[PDB]
Symmetry: D2
């Protein structure tokens, strides 16, 4: 049985208003299933359940919370193929990706945080004589999490792993475009023994369920991943009760290839950086910044590789690139081909739907490479979020850095060089939360992930995530302080 | 010579529009001086100066940022008397307090952060074989800081200590009601060698300079201490560029006295907690929560102490309590006495201006103790922010806890008992960022200070403040990762 | 099949000289089995195997080392009954203790360190401009571990958990008196996938296998638990190659009962503190230090409880206390009854073997309580290591502290009081690595465990253990330091 | 007035036996002065004083201990020229080096630790429900420190900075060869307000004062820097009371130059690495390991630079290299020149005293460069500790690594290359506590410094030094643990 209902207080249930949403398969636009569609009243029920569960969940020994997460990681791995199939069906990710990347990264992140739960420690502060001052890292309470459609399975672990490990209870609103793997995950949570109310899943529209969750007076923190524009609306919503906010927003990642780069490695790395996940990744290498000396040779080979990518049915293990996750998103991406040409950009390959008649009803676009004239051009500035890379050239390291920092974003970045000093100097100077040298999109559940500036704030992963999901509770005991009276009598 | 101008890019300067504000002495309403009144255009010049200075300030070794803060601490101590006099003149703080508390706490916090600058360390993450992942704690950039009028001198250290130590440049908007000590502090900063543009001071109205600072696109973080309402406006303003936000908003601190307390210590503690600084402290012990068996005995002594407090001219060394800082605030506090009586509270002492004719022109109110009918009464819920304490009684530990947590605030808290288990159990369960046991208002520059819920987020002091004034910069080096091509050919 | 051979390089093997050691059941003195008896040559083979395995084990991603430990914890839990039966057979621990304490503590500690493996992080140091300095916590290499007979199963986890998680390989010499559970643990390690050579177990005499392991030039650290006198010999042995040393040595724990203690709780706590594990615990509460006001009432009840303890066959689930682990150890304990009487001590209960004829061939002694006249008496100074507690009385808190600190040991300690100040003050002033308030012998795999002074140095458990099983590796990159020549030309 | 007596309990005093030692000027063999010669009885007096002082020193707020170290740093800087002159007179270091390096590094280290004192924090461990477990980092007590003659002034700070910051009291035995600057340091300590007994200085012979200090039952830790043989003797002495031990025991540092190195930087780096301080540095780059393709080129320039180094009177600011510190050490270095030639090494420059007759009575030797026939030759294996470098060549990275790791030492190391992967890969694989890339001998008071294997254990500098100068004190409070009785009745 594929689960399709909301999950509130340990049960699968219909939405209060009995609404549904059609969930589509991006390979052919067919209806996979209808899901229950959470609205404000459902979010209220979910927050109520999380509130009731919080005292017992936070009071549970940290090792006990940890153990549940470990059991969940094992269960995810035991269900790898079914979860991969479901994620591919819903998202359009090639089955080879959901098998090799989506499922294992999800399990690995839950396993990490299972081991992390009882490794977060408080502190003892050296203060005045006769005083003891201990500081706990206490959970916040009920945390609300809003997740987009590009890595829905993976994001269950990135969001919930630290939140739960830290002793918070959760209301998570996954994308209504791709909600199916998230409902399976919570089903597994119940199976391994998560208590009722600790995790509540409320798929529904952003403007119904998402808005209520961000505004809710009983929620202590809202975590959001998506567009910079929607990020602003999350911040606006947080004013009501001054809930804490975490934001992972746009990127327009530079992928810089210097003239001493290993071209083999860099060409493959560039293709990985932008075409993996159909470019639907906030850290995609969407700006390919090529040293003038190697640019022609790089592009000859990179264009040939891109043109060869096998586009097709996500469920075929031979498929290398799937469709985009929605029709609207496909049109968004194609529209940027027109934008690019109007500003004198050259389309080196792709920029249209594939020919194959078997793909005619899916949201497919060919890998697209455009060379732009200036780093200020629209396609060099605006997030396309598809398999679409904009090429720029440079001479000096200073030029490469200026290009890298030329946008409104600062999420990921990376560069290919074999010069020791350059690697570290560039990495320090690029405006980004993450910089990959001679690799790209390396993620690890202990390695802090997030942005600077308009790319948001807060970090997923590691001790950083645990810090962001707890609050300092400072306690002072006056043992022998011998404090003189302030008003002497 | 008393400085009265804006401090921008290393120089004292008039405001662009040449506006001024009158700074009053609360002892008598006299105009001490005009100051230059910063508006948006001055904030822009200040942010520009800070932006220009940031690269060289951030590139300075941490130890040498630290040395400057160390030298500043020494310079403050060397100027103790003159600084104390100026603070007392502006704020109404008794000279005995500005000498013993305001100046020393300010010096201690700068000294702490001077030693802290090169103690903040990054991390190295264990990741896949053949990869090196190091994480720096980099400064944010230009940080904006808005501070109120109750501890202006001390706030310079609480705000600027961590921000500067961490490598940020600063634009600070002190209260236009009490700006004078902050201008002397930045003059000392220049004297000890702070580079031009690293610290910029722009006193002006909230709605001119403050609003622009919070909205400014060149500012990476805004820190605000003051009212909940205004805190919401700071949040709203942050949307433009998604700058990070730190908020310290109201408190309504419970001060709980159990029947096994050392009453001598607790009585003195209670008087310190609410009457020090004329009650103008976010962490004031404004709700005195007394066990029924000892409430009458406690009050008889506490009321006698309170009625004896010597109210008078701040510059008199015998003065124990000064005036409130502004006419507006005094009227507010007197309004709450009326409210208290209106809702059936019993004013046990105080509630009106002192009799002494010499004090007729100043913003004086006597220490005020009111016993409230209910924990839901206005004076038991709303921040009065004056030398005004509301008394409530309880029997059981559970009722003490319920009272303690019955407000919209969660900043500080404390309790007096000699029972081991009760002390730790109550401390864990009270909604507050700080809990003092057998003491109150203990502050130390290493001990994290801030609130939960609508009292805000972020922490002053310690490693916590350094974390909130830096960002994670994760760098990955592929040394020997041997990453297979994603598109195999 | 019960394993009895050495475990070297992934296989169970006989000893080079083909020697054996008889393993006795302390309930009746019968030979359970013969084990292979390691000598110096076998230690050499084990070190060689650990040396060969070290590069691949340390190069393994920390998460993959951690996963092995997690799997081992699960395997131990799945085999709780058989492991408990085996430990009880060999050690004399009541089966109810091996089921409820020995097995679960072993699993919990291995699980903790499995989670810990990829949570240990390096650091990045703020240094001169243009330099990058990162510091790794690298494993030491091959570590030797020598473990006594009182908690042999539990000690496998306490020693091997941090060592392995940190990326060291291990040669462990368990006690030849109680080696059987350790050989089962290593077999489980092989089953869950630990590589050959990573863990090597060499049961044999201290003076053959132990001495060679301590002296071995290829071993980078030796960890020892046991007597202070043998610890000296470990230190001596370490001179050869200046290997690192960790020591947990004698204890003579004070268990202090103030006149405001919960007597119910403290009487039960005292019995647990000394009679659990037949008092064969370094942290046993072997000095019961009683406030004069409560001493008579406490003793009447404590003596009644002690004399009611059900002594019997360890394999009966009704048994509350088993025999001591060896004949020679029984005689040590009994000899101290004579010592106690000669210095005018009074035996309140026990001090002889039980009467039950079924127990005649086992190493059984009744729970023994002696009241000594002075804290300087032999039975108040010398470690007895059996179910033998020495009572002293006191008046003031200062005398209780003086008594507590009157021995040559400093391992564990504890006290029973309800006074908040006293509890923290005493805990700070007592010479010990651990102090339990209103409890005793609380152990947790994150909570550092070890002594001060002659009780040794280093810590089991937590991040402290990880620090002690790694070494700092500092790497400096001069990116842009621009260092002027020292000899200017 | 040059102080020459022992410093014990706040006072300069003669030795109990009234013995003295002659302190020589290495420029001319002349007697600077006689110093008091501590023997065992004086060590006893010093440890007694430190024991008496410990309770009040450890009880002082951390910030107050910190403030004293901060003041000391300033006083050192205020006395730069006189300290530099005294250090140069006693040690032979060129005045330019004592001014630019010895004094500033000493001040910087005390300043770092003065700021560190109140930054070391304890922990709160997540444990069973209803228990609070906090862990303090408490000082050890009285610590003994034994220091050689090569950087005597700097060693005062490296040793005493962390020990004092952490709350220990100190008995320091400086080298009797170069005791004078240490006696001035402790005089400054008294001047800035260090309490009597907190720091005690006992210059005397190793076999009288040093041996007693290492054996003393009142000393909780001994820290020793010097020869391997003497380190073994320290270890042996530690057995008495099982005091903690720290050892820094020499080096035979590889300085590897790859064929892609910046030769200008590397030639200057090599000269600094071995000729600074006359090669009397345990981290000296004493093995120059050169890639075959650049070896001849490098050596032609390096030999020319070395031959040009200006040898002469330490008091002349034009002097670049002074004499060795003692006649005995000079004879040892001259003997190693003979050894080098005996084994077929090629002396490329130096190897004997300079001919200038004004230097005839001093312990002078010219910068000496020997190309060795094999990496196993004596001068390629044994510490010469003079301005003496042994050259070896290689052809693959693996050969360079094999050479690097071919000695019995593992203290410092470094390499010069511009290949990114090689830099980090080689740094990870070299057996050493420290690895410098494109630089050498970079030391910072936050960057841990120490060896592996026979080079010792423990670390100077940073949080690492603070850890090694404290002990974990774990306190458990049973608040609401609800522990069932073990013996159910
Ligand atoms: N106004 C909104 N409030 C809350 N959530 C939203 C809003 N708009 C979209 N979302 C959700 O946020 C995720 C991504 O939105 P976007 O930032 O527009 O990429 C999806 O899961 C949406 O359901
Ligand atoms: N709209 C505003 N935006 C920014 N700052 C303000 C605003 N209104 C007042 N402030 C400043 O915030 C501090 C405390 O404000 P409040 O909490 O409104 O009393 C003072 O320095 C005020 O000048
Ligand atoms: N001289 C020794 N050297 C090394 N290990 C020993 C020595 N004597 C005993 N052991 C082992 O260390 C543990 C406890 O020894 P002890 O503390 O002397 O009773 C047991 O496992 C012994 O086999
Ligand atoms: N047996 C010893 N015990 C303790 N310290 C010594 C001993 N012999 C020499 N020292 C001291 O250790 C430092 C370095 O000595 P060494 O390594 O023997 O050259 C000097 O301050 C010596 O005086």
């Amino acid at each position: 049985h594929m689960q399709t209902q909301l999950f509130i207080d340990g049960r699968f249930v219909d939405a209060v208003d009995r609404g549904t949403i059609d969930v589509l398969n991006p390979h052919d636009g067919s209806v996979i299933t209808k899901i229950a569609a959470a609205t404000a009243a459902d979010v209220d029920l979910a927050v109520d359940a999380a509130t009731r569960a919080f005292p017992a969940w936070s009071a549970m020994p940290a090792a006990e919370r940890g153990r549940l997460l470990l059991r969940l990681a094992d269960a995810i791995e035991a269900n790898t193929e079914a979860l991969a199939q479901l994620e591919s069906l819903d998202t359009g990710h090639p089955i080879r990706d959901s098998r090799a990347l989506d499922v294992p990264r999800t399990a690995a992140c839950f396993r990490y945080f299972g081991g992390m739960a009882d490794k977060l420690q408080g502190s003892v502060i050296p203060v005045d004589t006769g005083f003891l001052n201990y500081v706990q890292r206490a959970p916040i309470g009920v945390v609300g999490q809003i997740v987009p459609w590009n890595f829905p399975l993976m994001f269950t672990s990135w969001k919930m792993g630290p939140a739960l490990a830290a002793g918070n209870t959760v209301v998570l609103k996954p994308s209504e475009i791709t909600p199916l793997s998230t409902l399976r995950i919570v089903e597994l949570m119940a199976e391994v023994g998560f208590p009722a109310g600790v995790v509540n899943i409320v798929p529904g529209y952003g403007h119904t369920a998402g808005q209520r969750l961000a505004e809710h007076p009983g929620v202590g923190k809202i975590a959001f991943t998506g567009s910079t524009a929607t990020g602003r609306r999350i911040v606006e919503a947080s004013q009501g009760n001054l809930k804490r906010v975490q934001l992972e927003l746009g990127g327009k990642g530079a992928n810089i290839v210097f003239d001493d780069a290993n071209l083999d490695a860099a060409i493959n790395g560039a293709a990985w950086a932008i075409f993996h996940n159909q470019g639907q990744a906030c850290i995609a290498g969407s700006r390919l910044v090529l040293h003038e000396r190697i640019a022609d040779a790089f592009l000859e080979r990179f264009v040939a590789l891109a043109s060869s990518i096998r586009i097709g049915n996500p469920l075929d293990p031979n498929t290398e690139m799937g469709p985009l996750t929605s029709k609207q998103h496909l049109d968004r991406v194609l529209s940027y081909v027109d934008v690019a040409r109007e500003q004198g950009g050259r389309v080196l390959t792709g920029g249209s739907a594939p020919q194959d008649p078997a793909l005619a009803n899916g949201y497919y676009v060919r890998p697209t490479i455009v060379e732009a004239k200036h780093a200020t051009d629209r396609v060099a500035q605006e997030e396309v979020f598809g398999p679409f890379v904009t090429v720029l050239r440079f001479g000096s390291d200073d030029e490469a850095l200026a290009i890298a920092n030329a946008t409104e974003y600062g999420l990921g970045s990376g560069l290919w060089t074999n010069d020791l000093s350059r690697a570290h100097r560039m990495a320090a100077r690029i405006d980004a939360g993450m910089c990959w040298i001679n690799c790209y999109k390396r993620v690890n559940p202990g390695s802090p992930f997030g942005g600077v500036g308009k790319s948001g704030y807060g970090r997923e992963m590691g001790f950083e995530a645990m810090h962001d999901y707890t609050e300092a509770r400072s306690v002072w005991v006056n043992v022998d302080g011998n404090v003189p009276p302030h008003f002497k009598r």
